[PDB]
CSV table of C-alpha atoms and ligand atoms in Angstrom, one decimal:
chain,number,residue,atom,x,y,z
A,1,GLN,CA,-12.7,21.3,4.5
A,2,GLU,CA,-14.9,18.7,4.7
A,3,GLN,CA,-13.1,15.2,6.0
A,4,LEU,CA,-13.7,12.3,7.2
A,5,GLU,CA,-11.1,10.5,10.1
A,6,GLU,CA,-11.1,6.8,11.3
A,7,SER,CA,-9.5,6.0,14.9
A,8,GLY,CA,-9.5,3.1,17.4
A,9,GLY,CA,-7.7,0.2,15.4
A,10,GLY,CA,-5.1,-1.2,16.8
A,11,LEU,CA,-3.4,-4.6,17.4
A,12,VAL,CA,-5.8,-6.7,18.8
A,13,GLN,CA,-5.8,-10.5,20.7
A,14,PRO,CA,-8.1,-13.7,18.6
A,15,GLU,CA,-11.5,-14.0,19.7
A,16,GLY,CA,-11.7,-10.1,21.1
A,17,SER,CA,-13.6,-7.3,20.4
A,18,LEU,CA,-12.6,-3.4,19.1
A,19,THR,CA,-14.8,-0.5,18.5
A,20,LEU,CA,-13.6,1.6,15.5
A,21,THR,CA,-14.9,5.2,15.4
A,22,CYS,CA,-15.3,8.0,12.4
A,23,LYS,CA,-15.2,11.6,13.4
A,24,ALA,CA,-16.8,14.1,10.6
A,25,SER,CA,-14.7,17.5,10.4
A,26,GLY,CA,-16.2,20.5,8.3
A,27,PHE,CA,-19.4,19.0,8.4
A,28,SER,CA,-22.3,17.4,10.9
A,29,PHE,CA,-24.3,15.0,9.1
A,30,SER,CA,-28.2,15.4,7.5
A,31,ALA,CA,-29.6,12.3,6.1
A,32,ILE,CA,-26.8,10.7,4.3
A,33,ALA,CA,-25.7,7.4,4.4
A,34,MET,CA,-21.9,6.3,6.3
A,35,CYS,CA,-20.3,3.7,5.4
A,36,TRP,CA,-17.7,1.6,6.1
A,37,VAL,CA,-15.2,-0.6,3.8
A,38,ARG,CA,-12.6,-2.4,4.8
A,39,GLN,CA,-9.4,-4.2,3.0
A,40,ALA,CA,-7.1,-6.9,4.1
A,41,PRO,CA,-3.2,-6.4,2.8
A,42,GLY,CA,-3.0,-6.9,-0.7
A,43,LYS,CA,-6.1,-7.9,-1.6
A,44,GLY,CA,-9.2,-5.6,-2.9
A,45,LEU,CA,-12.0,-3.6,-1.2
A,46,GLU,CA,-14.9,-5.4,0.8
A,47,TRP,CA,-18.2,-3.4,1.8
A,48,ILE,CA,-19.5,-3.9,5.5
A,49,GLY,CA,-22.2,-1.6,6.1
A,50,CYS,CA,-23.7,1.9,6.0
A,51,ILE,CA,-26.1,3.5,8.5
A,52,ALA,CA,-28.6,5.7,7.9
A,53,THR,CA,-27.9,8.9,10.4
A,54,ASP,CA,-31.4,10.2,10.6
A,55,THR,CA,-33.1,7.3,11.1
A,56,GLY,CA,-30.1,4.9,12.6
A,57,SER,CA,-31.2,2.2,9.9
A,58,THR,CA,-28.1,-0.1,8.7
A,59,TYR,CA,-27.6,-1.9,6.3
A,60,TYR,CA,-25.2,-4.8,6.1
A,61,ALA,CA,-23.1,-6.9,4.5
A,62,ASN,CA,-24.8,-10.5,4.7
A,63,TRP,CA,-21.3,-11.7,5.8
A,64,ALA,CA,-21.1,-8.9,8.4
A,65,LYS,CA,-24.3,-9.3,10.0
A,66,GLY,CA,-24.1,-9.9,13.4
A,67,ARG,CA,-21.0,-9.2,14.3
A,68,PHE,CA,-20.4,-5.4,13.3
A,69,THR,CA,-22.6,-3.2,14.4
A,70,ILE,CA,-22.5,0.4,13.5
A,71,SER,CA,-24.2,3.1,15.7
A,72,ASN,CA,-24.3,6.8,15.2
A,73,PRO,CA,-23.8,8.0,18.6
A,74,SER,CA,-23.0,11.5,17.1
A,75,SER,CA,-24.3,14.5,14.6
A,76,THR,CA,-20.4,14.4,14.0
A,77,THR,CA,-19.0,10.1,14.9
A,78,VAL,CA,-20.6,6.6,13.6
A,79,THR,CA,-18.4,3.9,15.3
A,80,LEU,CA,-18.3,0.2,14.1
A,81,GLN,CA,-18.1,-2.5,16.9
A,82,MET,CA,-16.5,-5.8,16.1
A,83,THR,CA,-16.4,-9.2,17.8
A,84,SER,CA,-15.1,-12.1,17.9
A,85,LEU,CA,-11.9,-11.0,15.3
A,86,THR,CA,-9.7,-13.6,13.5
A,87,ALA,CA,-6.7,-13.5,11.3
A,88,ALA,CA,-9.2,-12.9,8.2
A,89,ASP,CA,-10.4,-9.7,10.1
A,90,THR,CA,-7.1,-7.9,9.8
A,91,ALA,CA,-7.3,-5.4,7.8
A,92,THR,CA,-7.2,-1.2,7.3
A,93,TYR,CA,-10.8,-0.3,7.7
A,94,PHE,CA,-11.6,2.6,6.3
A,95,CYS,CA,-15.4,4.8,6.1
A,96,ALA,CA,-17.2,6.9,3.9
A,97,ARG,CA,-19.9,9.6,3.6
A,98,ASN,CA,-22.0,7.2,0.4
A,99,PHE,CA,-18.8,6.2,-1.4
A,100,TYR,CA,-17.4,9.5,-2.3
A,101,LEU,CA,-15.3,11.1,0.5
A,102,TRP,CA,-13.1,8.9,2.7
A,103,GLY,CA,-11.0,8.8,6.1
A,104,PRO,CA,-7.1,7.8,4.6
A,105,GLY,CA,-8.1,4.5,6.9
A,106,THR,CA,-6.8,2.6,10.7
A,107,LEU,CA,-5.0,-0.8,10.7
A,108,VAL,CA,-7.0,-3.3,12.9
A,109,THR,CA,-4.5,-6.2,13.6
A,110,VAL,CA,-5.5,-9.4,14.6
A,111,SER,CA,-2.9,-11.6,16.5
A,112,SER,CA,-1.3,-12.6,19.6
A,113,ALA,CA,1.7,-11.9,18.7
A,114,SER,CA,3.6,-9.0,21.0
A,115,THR,CA,4.2,-5.5,20.1
A,116,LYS,CA,7.4,-4.6,19.6
A,117,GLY,CA,10.1,-1.9,17.9
A,118,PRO,CA,12.4,-1.6,15.3
A,119,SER,CA,15.6,-1.3,15.4
A,120,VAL,CA,17.3,1.5,12.9
A,121,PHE,CA,20.7,0.5,11.5
A,122,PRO,CA,22.2,2.7,8.5
A,123,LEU,CA,23.0,1.6,4.8
A,124,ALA,CA,26.1,3.7,4.1
A,125,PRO,CA,27.2,5.1,1.2
A,126,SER,CA,29.8,3.4,-0.9
A,127,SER,CA,33.4,5.0,0.0
A,128,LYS,CA,33.3,3.0,-3.9
A,129,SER,CA,31.2,6.0,-5.0
A,130,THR,CA,31.8,7.6,-8.4
A,131,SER,CA,32.4,11.0,-7.9
A,132,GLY,CA,30.3,12.9,-10.7
A,133,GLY,CA,27.9,10.8,-10.7
A,134,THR,CA,25.0,9.6,-8.3
A,135,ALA,CA,25.0,7.9,-4.3
A,136,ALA,CA,23.2,5.7,-2.3
A,137,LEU,CA,22.1,5.7,1.4
A,138,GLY,CA,18.9,4.1,3.3
A,139,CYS,CA,18.2,3.2,7.1
A,140,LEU,CA,17.0,-0.3,7.4
A,141,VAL,CA,13.9,-0.3,9.7
A,142,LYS,CA,14.6,-4.4,11.5
A,143,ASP,CA,12.2,-6.2,13.2
A,144,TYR,CA,8.9,-4.7,14.3
A,145,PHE,CA,5.6,-5.6,15.3
A,146,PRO,CA,2.5,-5.3,13.5
A,147,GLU,CA,2.5,-2.8,11.2
A,148,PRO,CA,2.4,0.5,9.7
A,149,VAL,CA,6.0,2.2,10.1
A,150,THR,CA,6.6,5.3,8.5
A,151,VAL,CA,10.1,7.0,7.4
A,152,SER,CA,11.0,10.6,6.1
A,153,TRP,CA,14.5,11.9,5.7
A,154,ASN,CA,15.7,15.4,7.1
A,155,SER,CA,12.2,15.3,8.5
A,156,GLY,CA,10.0,15.9,5.2
A,157,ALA,CA,12.9,18.2,3.1
A,158,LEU,CA,14.3,15.7,1.7
A,159,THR,CA,12.3,13.2,-0.9
A,160,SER,CA,13.2,13.7,-4.0
A,161,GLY,CA,14.8,10.0,-5.1
A,162,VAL,CA,13.6,8.0,-1.9
A,163,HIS,CA,12.5,5.1,-1.6
A,164,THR,CA,10.6,3.3,0.9
A,165,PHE,CA,10.3,-0.6,0.3
A,166,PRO,CA,6.6,-2.6,1.5
A,167,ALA,CA,7.8,-4.4,4.6
A,168,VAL,CA,8.5,-8.0,4.7
A,169,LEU,CA,7.8,-10.5,7.7
A,170,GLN,CA,10.0,-12.6,8.3
A,171,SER,CA,10.0,-16.0,9.4
A,172,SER,CA,10.2,-14.7,13.4
A,173,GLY,CA,7.2,-12.8,12.4
A,174,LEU,CA,8.4,-9.9,12.4
A,175,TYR,CA,8.2,-7.3,9.5
A,176,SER,CA,11.6,-5.5,8.2
A,177,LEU,CA,11.9,-3.0,5.3
A,178,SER,CA,14.3,-0.8,4.3
A,179,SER,CA,14.5,3.1,3.0
A,180,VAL,CA,16.8,4.5,0.6
A,181,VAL,CA,17.7,7.9,-0.9
A,182,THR,CA,19.8,8.3,-4.1
A,183,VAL,CA,22.1,11.8,-4.1
A,184,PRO,CA,25.0,13.3,-6.0
A,185,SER,CA,28.2,11.6,-4.8
A,186,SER,CA,29.9,14.6,-4.6
A,187,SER,CA,27.2,15.6,-1.8
A,188,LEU,CA,28.1,12.9,0.8
A,189,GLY,CA,30.7,14.9,2.6
A,190,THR,CA,28.9,18.3,2.8
A,191,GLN,CA,25.2,17.3,3.8
A,192,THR,CA,24.0,16.1,5.9
A,193,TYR,CA,21.5,13.0,5.9
A,194,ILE,CA,18.6,11.4,8.8
A,195,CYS,CA,15.9,9.7,8.4
A,196,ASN,CA,13.0,9.7,10.5
A,197,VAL,CA,11.5,6.8,11.5
A,198,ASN,CA,8.3,6.4,13.6
A,199,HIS,CA,6.8,3.2,14.4
A,200,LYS,CA,3.9,4.2,16.6
A,201,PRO,CA,2.4,1.2,16.9
A,202,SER,CA,5.0,0.8,19.3
A,203,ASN,CA,5.6,4.2,21.0
A,204,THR,CA,8.9,4.6,18.4
A,205,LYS,CA,10.8,7.4,17.4
A,206,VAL,CA,14.2,7.6,16.0
A,207,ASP,CA,16.2,9.6,13.9
A,208,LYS,CA,19.3,8.5,12.2
A,209,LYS,CA,22.0,9.8,10.2
A,210,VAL,CA,23.4,8.5,8.0
A,211,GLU,CA,27.5,8.5,7.0
A,212,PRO,CA,30.2,7.4,5.1
A,213,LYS,CA,32.0,5.1,6.9
B,1,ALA,CA,-25.2,-13.0,-2.1
B,2,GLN,CA,-25.0,-9.9,-4.8
B,3,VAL,CA,-21.7,-10.9,-7.8
B,4,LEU,CA,-20.4,-8.2,-9.2
B,5,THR,CA,-17.9,-9.9,-11.3
B,6,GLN,CA,-15.0,-7.8,-12.2
B,7,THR,CA,-12.2,-8.2,-15.5
B,8,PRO,CA,-9.8,-8.4,-16.8
B,9,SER,CA,-7.1,-9.1,-13.0
B,10,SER,CA,-4.7,-7.3,-14.7
B,11,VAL,CA,-4.1,-5.5,-17.8
B,12,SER,CA,-1.0,-3.2,-19.7
B,13,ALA,CA,-0.6,-1.0,-22.4
B,14,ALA,CA,1.6,1.5,-23.2
B,15,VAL,CA,1.1,5.5,-22.8
B,16,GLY,CA,-1.1,6.6,-25.0
B,17,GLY,CA,-3.3,4.0,-25.2
B,18,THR,CA,-6.7,2.7,-24.2
B,19,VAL,CA,-7.6,-0.1,-21.4
B,20,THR,CA,-10.9,-1.2,-21.0
B,21,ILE,CA,-12.7,-2.7,-17.4
B,22,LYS,CA,-16.1,-4.4,-17.3
B,23,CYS,CA,-17.9,-5.6,-14.3
B,24,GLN,CA,-20.8,-7.6,-14.9
B,25,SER,CA,-23.5,-8.4,-11.8
B,26,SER,CA,-25.8,-10.9,-11.5
B,27,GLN,CA,-28.4,-8.6,-10.3
B,28,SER,CA,-29.2,-5.3,-11.1
B,29,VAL,CA,-28.2,-2.5,-9.2
B,30,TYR,CA,-30.8,0.1,-8.5
B,31,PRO,CA,-31.2,2.6,-10.2
B,32,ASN,CA,-29.8,1.1,-12.8
B,33,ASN,CA,-26.8,3.9,-13.4
B,34,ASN,CA,-26.1,3.4,-9.5
B,35,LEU,CA,-22.3,1.9,-9.9
B,36,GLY,CA,-19.6,4.1,-9.1
B,37,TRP,CA,-15.6,3.6,-10.5
B,38,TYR,CA,-12.4,4.4,-8.6
B,39,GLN,CA,-9.1,4.1,-8.5
B,40,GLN,CA,-6.2,2.6,-5.5
B,41,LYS,CA,-2.8,3.9,-5.1
B,42,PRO,CA,-0.8,2.6,-2.4
B,43,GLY,CA,-1.2,3.4,1.4
B,44,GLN,CA,-4.6,5.4,-0.2
B,45,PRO,CA,-8.5,5.5,-0.1
B,46,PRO,CA,-10.1,4.7,-3.0
B,47,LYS,CA,-10.7,7.7,-5.4
B,48,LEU,CA,-14.3,7.9,-7.1
B,49,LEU,CA,-13.5,8.7,-10.8
B,50,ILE,CA,-17.5,8.1,-11.7
B,51,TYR,CA,-20.5,7.6,-9.9
B,52,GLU,CA,-24.1,7.5,-11.5
B,53,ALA,CA,-22.8,4.3,-14.0
B,54,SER,CA,-21.0,7.5,-16.7
B,55,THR,CA,-20.6,10.9,-14.1
B,56,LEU,CA,-17.6,12.5,-14.4
B,57,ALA,CA,-16.1,13.3,-10.2
B,58,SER,CA,-15.5,16.1,-9.8
B,59,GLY,CA,-11.8,17.3,-11.4
B,60,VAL,CA,-11.4,13.8,-13.1
B,61,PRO,CA,-10.4,14.0,-16.5
B,62,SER,CA,-13.1,13.1,-19.5
B,63,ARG,CA,-10.5,9.9,-20.7
B,64,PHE,CA,-11.9,7.9,-18.2
B,65,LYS,CA,-15.2,7.4,-19.5
B,66,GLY,CA,-17.9,4.8,-17.5
B,67,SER,CA,-21.2,3.5,-20.0
B,68,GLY,CA,-23.2,0.9,-19.3
B,69,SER,CA,-26.7,-0.3,-17.5
B,70,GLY,CA,-28.3,-2.7,-15.2
B,71,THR,CA,-26.4,-5.3,-15.2
B,72,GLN,CA,-23.4,-4.6,-17.6
B,73,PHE,CA,-21.0,-1.5,-16.9
B,74,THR,CA,-17.1,-0.7,-18.3
B,75,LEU,CA,-14.7,1.5,-17.6
B,76,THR,CA,-12.9,2.8,-20.8
B,77,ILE,CA,-8.9,4.9,-19.7
B,78,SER,CA,-8.2,5.7,-22.8
B,79,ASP,CA,-5.3,8.2,-23.0
B,80,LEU,CA,-2.8,6.5,-20.8
B,81,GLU,CA,-0.4,7.7,-18.5
B,82,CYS,CA,2.1,6.4,-16.4
B,83,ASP,CA,-0.2,8.5,-13.0
B,84,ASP,CA,-3.5,5.8,-14.2
B,85,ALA,CA,-0.7,3.3,-12.8
B,86,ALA,CA,-3.2,1.9,-9.8
B,87,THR,CA,-5.5,-0.5,-9.1
B,88,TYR,CA,-10.0,-0.1,-10.2
B,89,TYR,CA,-12.5,-1.3,-8.4
B,90,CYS,CA,-16.2,-1.2,-9.6
B,91,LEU,CA,-19.0,-1.0,-6.9
B,92,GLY,CA,-22.9,-1.6,-7.1
B,93,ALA,CA,-25.6,-0.7,-5.0
B,94,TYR,CA,-29.4,-2.6,-4.7
B,95,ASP,CA,-32.4,-3.0,-3.6
B,96,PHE,CA,-31.2,-3.5,0.2
B,97,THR,CA,-34.9,-4.1,1.2
B,98,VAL,CA,-34.9,-7.7,-0.6
B,99,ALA,CA,-31.1,-7.9,-0.9
B,100,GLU,CA,-27.5,-7.3,0.0
B,101,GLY,CA,-27.1,-3.6,-0.1
B,102,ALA,CA,-23.5,-3.0,-1.8
B,103,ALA,CA,-20.7,-5.2,-3.8
B,104,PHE,CA,-17.3,-4.1,-4.9
B,105,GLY,CA,-15.9,-6.0,-8.1
B,106,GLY,CA,-12.9,-7.7,-8.0
B,107,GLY,CA,-10.0,-5.2,-8.6
B,108,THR,CA,-8.5,-4.5,-11.9
B,109,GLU,CA,-4.8,-3.8,-11.7
B,110,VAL,CA,-3.4,-1.6,-14.5
B,111,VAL,CA,0.6,-1.4,-15.8
B,112,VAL,CA,1.9,0.9,-18.1
B,113,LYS,CA,4.1,-0.5,-20.4
B,114,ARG,CA,7.6,1.6,-21.5
B,115,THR,CA,11.4,1.3,-22.8
B,116,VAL,CA,13.6,-0.8,-21.3
B,117,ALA,CA,15.4,0.8,-18.8
B,118,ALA,CA,18.5,-0.3,-16.3
B,119,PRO,CA,19.0,-0.3,-12.7
B,120,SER,CA,21.5,1.7,-10.8
B,121,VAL,CA,22.9,-1.5,-8.3
B,122,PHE,CA,24.3,-0.6,-4.7
B,123,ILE,CA,25.7,-3.4,-1.6
B,124,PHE,CA,25.5,-1.7,1.6
B,125,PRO,CA,27.7,-3.8,4.6
B,126,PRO,CA,26.1,-4.1,7.7
B,127,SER,CA,26.0,-1.8,9.9
B,128,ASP,CA,28.3,-2.5,13.2
B,129,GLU,CA,25.8,-1.6,15.5
B,130,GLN,CA,23.5,-4.3,14.2
B,131,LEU,CA,26.0,-6.8,14.5
B,132,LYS,CA,27.0,-6.3,17.4
B,133,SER,CA,23.5,-8.4,18.0
B,134,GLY,CA,25.2,-11.3,16.7
B,135,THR,CA,22.9,-11.0,13.0
B,136,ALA,CA,24.3,-9.1,9.7
B,137,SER,CA,22.4,-7.7,6.9
B,138,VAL,CA,23.2,-7.1,3.4
B,139,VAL,CA,21.5,-5.0,1.2
B,140,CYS,CA,21.8,-4.8,-2.4
B,141,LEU,CA,19.5,-2.1,-4.4
B,142,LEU,CA,18.5,-1.6,-7.5
B,143,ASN,CA,17.0,1.7,-8.5
B,144,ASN,CA,14.4,2.8,-10.6
B,145,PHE,CA,14.8,0.0,-13.8
B,146,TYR,CA,11.7,-1.6,-16.2
B,147,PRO,CA,10.6,-4.1,-16.9
B,148,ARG,CA,9.5,-5.6,-12.8
B,149,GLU,CA,12.1,-9.0,-14.1
B,150,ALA,CA,15.1,-9.7,-12.5
B,151,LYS,CA,17.5,-11.6,-11.0
B,152,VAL,CA,19.4,-11.3,-7.6
B,153,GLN,CA,22.5,-13.4,-7.0
B,154,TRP,CA,24.4,-13.3,-3.7
B,155,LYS,CA,28.1,-14.9,-3.3
B,156,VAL,CA,29.9,-15.4,-0.7
B,157,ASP,CA,33.2,-15.5,-0.8
B,158,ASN,CA,32.2,-16.6,-4.6
B,159,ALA,CA,30.0,-19.2,-3.2
B,160,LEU,CA,26.2,-18.6,-3.8
B,161,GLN,CA,24.0,-18.0,-1.7
B,162,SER,CA,20.1,-19.7,-1.5
B,163,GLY,CA,18.0,-19.8,1.3
B,164,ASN,CA,18.7,-16.8,3.0
B,165,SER,CA,17.5,-13.7,1.3
B,166,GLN,CA,14.4,-11.9,0.9
B,167,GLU,CA,13.5,-9.2,-1.9
B,168,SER,CA,10.8,-6.3,-1.5
B,169,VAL,CA,9.3,-4.2,-4.5
B,170,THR,CA,8.4,-1.4,-4.8
B,171,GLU,CA,5.0,-0.2,-6.4
B,172,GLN,CA,5.2,1.3,-10.7
B,173,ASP,CA,6.1,4.9,-10.5
B,174,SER,CA,4.0,6.8,-10.4
B,175,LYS,CA,6.2,9.3,-12.8
B,176,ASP,CA,8.1,7.0,-15.1
B,177,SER,CA,6.7,3.6,-14.7
B,178,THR,CA,9.9,1.8,-13.2
B,179,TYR,CA,10.4,-0.4,-10.4
B,180,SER,CA,13.2,-0.6,-7.4
B,181,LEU,CA,13.9,-3.9,-5.4
B,182,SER,CA,15.8,-4.5,-2.2
B,183,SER,CA,17.7,-8.3,-1.2
B,184,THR,CA,18.3,-8.5,1.7
B,185,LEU,CA,20.6,-11.2,3.3
B,186,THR,CA,20.4,-12.4,6.5
B,187,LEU,CA,23.7,-14.0,8.0
B,188,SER,CA,24.3,-14.1,12.1
B,189,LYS,CA,27.3,-12.3,13.1
B,190,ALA,CA,29.7,-15.5,13.1
B,191,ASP,CA,28.7,-16.6,9.7
B,192,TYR,CA,29.4,-13.4,8.1
B,193,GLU,CA,32.7,-13.1,9.9
B,194,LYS,CA,33.9,-16.1,8.4
B,195,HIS,CA,33.9,-14.5,5.1
B,196,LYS,CA,35.9,-11.5,2.7
B,197,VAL,CA,34.4,-10.9,-0.5
B,198,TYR,CA,29.7,-9.6,-0.4
B,199,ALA,CA,28.8,-9.3,-3.8
B,200,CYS,CA,25.2,-8.7,-5.7
B,201,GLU,CA,25.1,-9.8,-9.2
B,202,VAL,CA,22.2,-8.2,-11.2
B,203,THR,CA,20.5,-10.2,-14.2
B,204,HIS,CA,18.3,-7.7,-16.3
B,205,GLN,CA,17.1,-7.0,-19.8
B,206,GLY,CA,18.1,-3.4,-19.4
B,207,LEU,CA,21.8,-4.3,-18.5
B,208,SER,CA,24.7,-5.1,-21.9
B,209,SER,CA,25.6,-7.6,-19.5
B,210,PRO,CA,25.6,-9.0,-15.3
B,211,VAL,CA,26.4,-6.1,-13.0
B,212,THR,CA,28.3,-7.1,-9.9
B,213,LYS,CA,28.4,-4.7,-6.4
B,214,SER,CA,30.9,-6.3,-4.4
B,215,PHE,CA,32.4,-5.0,-0.9
B,216,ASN,CA,35.6,-6.6,1.4
B,217,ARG,CA,34.3,-7.0,5.2
B,218,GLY,CA,36.5,-4.7,7.4
B,219,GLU,CA,37.9,-2.1,4.4
C,1,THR,CA,-39.6,5.4,0.8
C,2,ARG,CA,-35.1,4.6,0.7
C,3,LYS,CA,-34.4,1.3,-1.7
C,4,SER,CA,-31.1,2.0,-2.1
C,5,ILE,CA,-27.6,4.0,-1.0
C,6,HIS,CA,-27.0,6.6,-3.8
C,7,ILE,CA,-22.9,5.7,-4.9
C,8,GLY,CA,-21.6,9.6,-5.2
C,9,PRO,CA,-22.5,12.9,-4.1
C,10,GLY,CA,-25.8,14.8,-4.1
C,11,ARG,CA,-28.4,12.7,-2.7
C,12,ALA,CA,-28.0,10.2,-0.2
C,13,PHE,CA,-30.2,7.7,-1.2
D,1,CA,CA1,-17.5,-6.4,-1.4
């Protein structure tokens, strides 16, 4: 029943500011420590600070003092205001109640690069598929910025054998990834497979139907 | 100014084995048991395993055991399972009236050892839709293999490619401890339409010899 | 008075 949810992340210009919000559900604050922790892509957890919700008293990591402000505007929200942002601040930001109840995180990306939605291409099953064996098919999600994108198959009805790879940053500065799934080679001509790609940062939703050529 | 040193950076053990992770703090946590241990799988928030140095969080199995006090703590994971493949962190909290209130250790990656498993290999030509835009992506999939090490070679009309491919690898699977890998070859439409045979050649400990998947541009 | 943040459920400080 008790949950936390971070909001307010996204793409922001270098030297800009951003305010994140952490929203409690299923409870309200009663003299607890609400904390902010971040994690740069591929790196470890790093503490930012905590606020005591009854007193408003705050406690920060030495590196964060001054630049990051945690406030408690309501019985169910804390905020993290961050200034003079830099690429070193690109990270997933988590809020936590006493470091045991955690939100899923929200991504902040500090860059001057433009938002760009992906193109979605089919990875078609091979015509040389061994008939009493397994075939592979997939979707190539190419040339987007910033992270993240999500991919599901048949709107979530198909999960077994699904692999969505970590995105790769191209020299262009744009990301691409592939999502693939393995199925019985004799399910190709009778069953329909659709990858559901969502790049929320660019407001892009694409459903691509993958079929043999 | 707080320093919490977590060792080792990585460790591997087989299913049923034991893994030992230590954190040493320059200052004592406050009170002397105020330390937690976390498990984090990719794309998820960290999950509290143990708090107050040795208290189990709800639902956490007893093969996770925390010990220590003050400036020296240990997490011992016994009876290892595939599901334990993850990164683990210690967190200390301190007298904030005299110093920094908290600090994380640097993390420990746990890799689960298992028997060799050969990859199933697949090759994908570029879509006609993409070709219209002047670029061709050719994708090679290596599926559900172990160990992680694998060599992928692209050949175009038998000419070895270099400089025009990138790889992506999944995290170790939580249920069978395997990996999957993609290698994507990027070519201009012009160059793509100059050649016929596109081949992905895979060398891996689990294969009795290199496996090649191929297609002829057009068919 | 409060001296540290309690890691884990239960008391907060
Ligand atoms: Ca830290």
